[model samples]
Target chain A: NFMLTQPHSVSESPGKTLTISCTGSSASIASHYVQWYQQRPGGAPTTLIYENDQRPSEVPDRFSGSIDSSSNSASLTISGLKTEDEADYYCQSYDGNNHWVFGGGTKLTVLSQPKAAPSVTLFPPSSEELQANKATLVCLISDFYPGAVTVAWKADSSPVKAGVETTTPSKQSNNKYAASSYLSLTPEQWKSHKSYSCQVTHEGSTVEKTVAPTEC
Target chain B: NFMLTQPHSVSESPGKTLTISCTGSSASIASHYVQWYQQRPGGAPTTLIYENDQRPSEVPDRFSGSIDSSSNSASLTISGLKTEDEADYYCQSYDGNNHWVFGGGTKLTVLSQPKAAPSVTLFPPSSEELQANKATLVCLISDFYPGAVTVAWKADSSPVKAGVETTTPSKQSNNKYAASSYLSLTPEQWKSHKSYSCQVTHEGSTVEKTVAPTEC
Candidate 1:
């Protein structure tokens, strides 16, 4: 069986570009044209290269590819990397026997700004809770990145006890990335939907975004 | 970046079936489907596998594929191997980025038969050589395998002096294999185009074949 293996992961600082290379054996790349791809979390992979150097019409101009004919090697380059660019990339080639092939993928993590915390935005905006002797409120944070961002529940702008959890991304057909997350709080603390924030420090940006939880 | 790597060459005894495996990273194979192809010398590749386990409608029934979701691998199998099956094979997948990807290829070399040597049959394959006091004739051969067959030019059942050379196979768009050979002799040999024979052990059988030469 022929297989494609890729590096596990990659990381780079914003403002600096990074490149990942894909190599295959004679049964895969040496006899066929090489292509490249890019995928973002929750979005589909985009074709960046075709037939060695020809880029598809839908591909963005930021991506480019080159081949070393003598060595039977191909490379893909992404210029002016952005935060949204942090995801995964892969390479593919044709097997002389009429088959298309792929390489393993490289996961790219973009570093956040130093001293500038990152933030997340939530949907709905508020939650309310009613208890024996008190009323509580909570908010929900929906989506965020860096995988290292932090979330907190607060009441009257004061910290409150809450539970947080994250889920692994799932692969979608067409090479898209997708995942979901959930946060839970005490019933009494959710009496009235209240605003909550997910704060993160990434690439020198301290981002605080708010959202509210909805009732079942 | 993710890429597919494959072996450069593969070999198996005649009648010993074999399967080559193709693996992809979580970003590619974990989601997208796999495809396979076959390419002969100097020919374009033909599709052999598609959608992981499905073969194109036109593919022969001997070819098949399967997938292991847990291992993120796809495989292509060739049953009842034949000498003519010697060629290159490759695997490919969609990169989710709008491009098809390929793997390194695997070159398959079929072992030659021990006894069945192929006999060359030349059309109008006779030649004659005449000198001041002597004359000689020769014959030509065609259609032999292992590309290492020996052709003996003979005049009146005796060996004639001449050169025999094999030409590289010309690849057609359909990916079939074709080749030719040439035998040259002195101008005087052309006078009475005589009979010649080209023979070789191919596919485990003795192949001694003769042909007469025709006007060029």
Candidate 2:
């Protein structure tokens, strides 16, 4: 009851293996089924494993859970690591008497670790580019690290959207990741010649480019 | 550890009152702090009351929580029933050993309850229409119970986004609740022939509609 120590964060490389640990008091794990959950940012808590080693029907085989009675603890082993597997893992168990316990969770950092910032390009188009057909303004981002990134848009300087379509970051053949976004705009709005921008953010830095719509 | 038991649902009307109970074993609540969580469907769980009686700064005064010391149980009560107050409430506790447990969740159906399910509509448009200069696909949910619901979007088969913006379901003067969401998108998204949908969920049920861009 004094402490529930977790690694905080654990790092591994893609296609490799890793184990997350959860420890509690002697009475807690020694008597019951430990529960595990996986939570991605902005997503609901999913029951990953329950009753110690049992995986629900939807949980995949790549992941398995266990209880180590010796230490009054639990572990979640993830094998054949994939990019989508990158998420926080949590553990819980009852104190058997009158208490229950938990953890803030472990952030699994799958490393490829790019050193360079992303390269960007804008897809601004003019009204004339549309009468013959149609298209949208887009921002392309590539060669970024840690894949978790944010893409946002603006009209003039105000933060607005015609509705913006931001993509989930995609992993490329190289060790880095790439992402892009489409701007919601009308040719009329484009002709307004207002400033539009695409800001691709990684780590903490956001790189933005002003619209370079065709001189139509 | 045993699963906590709670009333399957609670019902109350605007300007009225109600109480939901979560019962647990004597060993747990008798010694541990009781806690409560609130979740709207298709959303994340939010902490309303922490450590039994400690209302977080963010929780509103209209609602409160408490624990029954003798029964080793917890409760949540609401009065002056605001429509939005209808939601899923959960109670949790620790064994002071290792277990932390949660009730299955209580559906608080605030009064002025509706007998009908929510109806959903999805909108689409062409590049020339310029209705959405950049882009926003709207989903309007009408005529729902106790008046709170949630909205989520999906593009293609995977959960894709057009910068999804969902609103809290609001109380419509007509007695039911109205909920809406705007999906971020580009006109190109219309041509991709992707399946775009708006899902309005409430009262233990969900209804949705698809979107197809209007032809030029």
Candidate 3:
């Protein structure tokens, strides 16, 4: 069965226009009806459009649906976007037989404010770990919105390539997110290094924290 | 976020009526719209009903939809069922936010004839396995339709509880289904027991095949 495909996410400012496309795979979109849905973060899904382009009575006129037969795709266009429009959008269609599929939801982020930068904190290995002939360093990333961040480590000057692991971002209760990266080293290597640095890059900017070898 | 629940499978005879239900969980069914889809095996899904109970232009009146606000559920009724109407059905709905869920599909079996019983064959252990002090017996079941069967193992007269495994049925080229059940035993146990039997029960009839220990 053919799948309905959509982008993973989209972003726009209030008052701008956003059009999300649902493309048909291996099937002609014109042969089937397409529906669109709007789901905010915490509520149920409300019908934005059904029977291809008809909106429910409770939906605003700014939300509209269309089909492009030439491209074999359907579109959900929201014009004059507002903060209230920040939600996930999905396009649904079926192959006319028994296969019904939905597009991967497109998360619409209404950029009402600047994206938050992550705060980076680096913790050196404890005395107990050094006693066991190993040292571990953690780079903590917290308080980031829209949670995409990259973590890197450096020993003195050169990039430390081995024994480094970064976790995917985890959401926090404050509507932000947290992530952590770890660097492993032998106690001898940790004592030999003059300094270590943890660098977190977010939204094209890098925030770095440095730590020196110290007794616990 | 709640789910829409439906039966895993349903069966009916031609000329009879079948009503498949989708019940809402946690959320009230009255608060939102529900949609139904009809999908034949290997075909794409087509809209059966939308906005809770409305049918499209091509759909027949015999296939009607209804919502039971009192029960917090929706129903799709196919009256005067025919062989052509045999297909999997699904119910779809969403909570008023980002969660959209579909009921696990219900396979509708339109019975036109008697269900086929499986042909059973028993194969004894080979020389190589007996040489290793262990033996494996196989029960082959073939040529069955509407593939739901239970396989059991017995030694002498008592039920064999451990070291027996049954595989899920697989479709054969002729549209019939096949399955296999295996019993593992120590070579000593195989020789000490008088017989071992493989029993396959399908459509209320149990077909069994027995094998005794034989030299390689």
The parts of candidate 3 lying over 4 Å away from their true place are A1-216, B1-13, B19-34, B41-43, B50-57, B65-75, B93-98, B109-113, B121-124, B150-175, B183-216
Model 3 chain A scores worst on lDDT over the 10 consecutive residues at A121-130
Q: Candidate 2 or 3, higher TM-score?
A: 3
Candidate with the greatest lDDT versus the true structure: 3
**What is every candidate's C-alpha DockQ against the true complex, given to 2 decimals?**
0.00, 0.02, 0.01
TM-score of candidate 1 to 2 decimals: 0.27
Order of models, best TM-score first: 3, 2, 1
Candidate 3: which docking quality band? incorrect
lDDT by residue for model 3 (B1-216), tens: 778899765668899998999998988887778899998766478998998889999998888889998889899999999988878899998886846779988878788656788866666764544666757776666677777678889899899968765555656555666665666678889988998988988866799877786532
Candidate number achieving the greatest DockQ relative to the actual structure: 2
TM of each candidate vs. truth: 0.27, 0.33, 0.36
Write one digit per residue (lDDT tens) for candidate 1, span B1-216: 445666555556777788887777646565777788898876578988878888788888879998877766777888888888888899888775748778988778686543222323332211111223322221222223333333445554676545543333322222222233334455456445466655543334555545443332
Candidate 2 segments exceeding 4 Å error = A1-216, B1-31, B35-110, B126-133
**lDDT of each model, Cα atoms only?**
0.54, 0.68, 0.78
lDDT of 2 by residue, B24-102 (tens): 8545565677788889876778888887778888878767888886776687877788888878898887654658777
